Scaffold this active site. Structure first.
Site, PDB file in Angstrom:
ATOM      1  CG  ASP A 192       1.633 -63.804 -33.589  1.00 21.28           C
ATOM      2  OD1 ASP A 192       0.840 -64.614 -34.043  1.00 21.28           O
ATOM      3  OD2 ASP A 192       2.298 -63.811 -32.478  1.00 21.28           O
ATOM      4  N   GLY A 238       8.410 -65.949 -16.768  1.00 19.31           N
ATOM      5  CA  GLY A 238       8.779 -66.907 -17.956  1.00 19.31           C
ATOM      6  C   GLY A 238      10.235 -66.646 -18.135  1.00 19.31           C
ATOM      7  CG  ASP A 288       4.040 -61.180 -28.409  1.00 22.09           C
ATOM      8  OD1 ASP A 288       4.464 -61.292 -27.492  1.00 22.09           O
ATOM      9  OD2 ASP A 288       4.314 -61.939 -29.617  1.00 22.09           O
ATOM     10  NE  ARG A 301       0.354 -67.651 -29.977  1.00 27.30           N
ATOM     11  CZ  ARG A 301       0.522 -67.310 -30.970  1.00 27.30           C
ATOM     12  NH1 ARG A 301       1.456 -66.474 -31.451  1.00 27.30           N
ATOM     13  NH2 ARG A 301       0.112 -67.697 -32.200  1.00 27.30           N
ATOM     14  CG  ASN A 302       0.240 -62.671 -28.943  1.00 30.19           C
ATOM     15  OD1 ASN A 302       1.247 -63.226 -28.123  1.00 30.19           O
ATOM     16  ND2 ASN A 302       0.391 -63.034 -30.458  1.00 30.19           N
ATOM     17  N   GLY A 356      13.181 -68.483 -21.434  1.00 31.85           N
ATOM     18  CA  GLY A 356      13.631 -68.858 -22.776  1.00 31.85           C
ATOM     19  C   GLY A 356      13.304 -68.063 -23.812  1.00 31.85           C
TER      20      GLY A 356
HETATM   21  C1  LIG Z   1       2.560 -55.690 -21.735  1.00 36.24           C
HETATM   22  C2  LIG Z   1       3.218 -56.392 -20.679  1.00 36.24           C
HETATM   23  C3  LIG Z   1       3.431 -57.790 -20.917  1.00 36.24           C
HETATM   24  C4  LIG Z   1       4.324 -58.345 -21.868  1.00 36.24           C
HETATM   25  C5  LIG Z   1       4.470 -59.769 -21.946  1.00 36.24           C
HETATM   26  O1  LIG Z   1       4.854 -60.011 -22.871  1.00 36.24           O
HETATM   27  N1  LIG Z   1       4.183 -60.477 -20.901  1.00 36.24           N
HETATM   28  C6  LIG Z   1       4.369 -62.075 -20.945  1.00 36.24           C
HETATM   29  C7  LIG Z   1       3.625 -62.791 -21.810  1.00 36.24           C
HETATM   30  C8  LIG Z   1       3.691 -64.014 -21.833  1.00 36.24           C
HETATM   31  C9  LIG Z   1       4.768 -64.530 -21.175  1.00 36.24           C
HETATM   32  C10 LIG Z   1       5.620 -63.743 -20.406  1.00 36.24           C
HETATM   33  C11 LIG Z   1       5.315 -62.526 -20.176  1.00 36.24           C
HETATM   34  C12 LIG Z   1       3.430 -59.994 -19.790  1.00 36.24           C
HETATM   35  N2  LIG Z   1       3.043 -60.865 -19.055  1.00 36.24           N
HETATM   36  C13 LIG Z   1       2.471 -60.608 -17.859  1.00 36.24           C
HETATM   37  N3  LIG Z   1       2.165 -61.347 -16.817  1.00 36.24           N
HETATM   38  C14 LIG Z   1       2.313 -62.785 -16.757  1.00 36.24           C
HETATM   39  C15 LIG Z   1       3.020 -63.545 -17.581  1.00 36.24           C
HETATM   40  C16 LIG Z   1       3.055 -64.773 -17.387  1.00 36.24           C
HETATM   41  C17 LIG Z   1       2.378 -65.446 -16.339  1.00 36.24           C
HETATM   42  C18 LIG Z   1       1.647 -64.592 -15.545  1.00 36.24           C
HETATM   43  C19 LIG Z   1       1.622 -63.458 -15.724  1.00 36.24           C
HETATM   44  O2  LIG Z   1       1.066 -62.641 -14.771  1.00 36.24           O
HETATM   45  C20 LIG Z   1       1.204 -62.657 -13.353  1.00 36.24           C
HETATM   46  N4  LIG Z   1       2.211 -59.084 -17.525  1.00 36.24           N
HETATM   47  C21 LIG Z   1       2.393 -58.174 -18.650  1.00 36.24           C
HETATM   48  C22 LIG Z   1       3.133 -58.545 -19.674  1.00 36.24           C
END
Ligand SMILES: *CCc1cc(=O)n(-c2ccccc2)c2nc(Nc3ccccc3OC)ncc12
Length: 305
Positions: free
Chosen positions: A142, A24, A160, A146-147, A26
């Site tokens: 929050d 991700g 989050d 989504r979180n 932005g």
């Molecule tokens: C605790 C670890 C963590 C935090 C976090 O903020 N993200 C996150 C959440 C939303 C968007 C981006 C990152 C994590 N994401 C992920 N994995 C992940 C994110 C987006 C799409 C696909 C995913 O898994 C393959 N893992 C741990 C996060």
């Protein structure tokens, strides 16, 4: 008044981990899929690396470091763990990889294959993590679908905490009335958000109060209107949601009670959620990115002396 917070904060060399792909981008920064090899030990840990894009905004770094502070201070199966911090030109947060992503995305994408046993189990796990936060006295402030992130389809974790605060010191639709009118946040206000979260799962990722102004929302709740009962939902499950949305916060149920109720239901899931072809459905070599590594261990199995 309070016990000393003796959590360890680990500093990581940039060389220790590699970024494989962008999950991700932005806002403050971008978060990468990654591999981490700790020092002398020979293990590979799948990680999510989040780092800052709009230079080193001093304004902005307080938010990132607060997130790190809170994340290091928590140890729970149903709460996301921070492995390390890397002090480069940009601050980098290394976190455990939740391979299946966002729980909200997951329900929407897999709605056709998600059984009642999974749903009730997710409800239990979120309550457990949130109860753990209550023990800590930390407030999520929050909580939303989504979180919540899914490590396996059978194992989710709360995330989050950047906005997270200690008890005793925007997502309007998830927020309690006390929070909307008076900017008051408590564990109990958190419970209300939990109810909305549960509603999102039961509706398979539907948007609450769809096509309503946030300006409207306080009046509606003041009016005594709430979210509709989901089709799949029995009155027993829906009542739990409703109790969460009670105006008197002390009247609302405790997370520890919510764990109990959903577990009872998880014991006999088809009685409490009715879903077409519930019996049929099943939910998930494998290791993406790297071919090389069978030294991979989950963060969870990776513990520190
Ligand atoms: C605790 C670890 C963590 C935090 C976090 O903020 N993200 C996150 C959440 C939303 C968007 C981006 C990152 C994590 N994401 C992920 N994995 C992940 C994110 C987006 C799409 C696909 C995913 O898994 C393959 N893992 C741990 C996060």
């Amino acid at each position: 008044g309070e016990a000393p917070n003796q959590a360890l904060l680990r500093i990581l060399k940039e060389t220790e981990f590699k970024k494989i792909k962008v999950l991700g981008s932005g806002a403050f920064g971008t978060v990468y899929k990654g591999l981490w090899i700790p020092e002398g030990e020979k293990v590979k840990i799948p990680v999510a690396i989040k780092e800052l894009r709009e230079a080193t905004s001093p304004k902005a770094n307080k938010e990132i470091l607060d997130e790190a502070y809170v994340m290091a201070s928590v140890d729970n199966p149903h709460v996301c763990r921070l492995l390390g911090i890397c002090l480069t030109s940009t601050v980098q947060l290394i976190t455990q990889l939740m391979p299946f992503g966002c729980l909200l995305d997951y329900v929407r994408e897999h709605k056709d294959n998600i059984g009642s046993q999974y749903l009730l189990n997710w409800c239990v796990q979120i309550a457990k993590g949130m109860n753990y936060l209550e023990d800590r006295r930390l407030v999520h402030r929050d909580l939303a679908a989504r979180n919540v992130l899914v490590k396996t389809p059978q194992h989710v974790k709360i995330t989050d905490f950047g906005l997270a605060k200690l008890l005793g010191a925007v997502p309007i639709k998830w927020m309690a009335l006390e929070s909307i009118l008076h900017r008051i946040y408590t564990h109990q206000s958190d419970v209300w958000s939990y109810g909305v979260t549960v509603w999102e799962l039961m509706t398979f990722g539907s948007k609450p109060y769809d096509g309503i102004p946030a300006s409207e929302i306080s009046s509606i709740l003041e009016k005594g209107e709430r979210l509709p009962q989901p089709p799949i939902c029995t009155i027993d499950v829906y009542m739990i949601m409703v109790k969460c949305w009670m105006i008197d916060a002390d009247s609302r149920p405790k997370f520890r009670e919510l764990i109990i109720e959903f577990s009872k239901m998880a014991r006999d899931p088809q009685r409490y959620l009715v879903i077409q072809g519930d019996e049929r459905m099943h939910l998930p070599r494998a290791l993406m990115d790297e071919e090389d590594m069978d030294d991979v261990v989950d963060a969870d199995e990776y513990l520190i002396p």
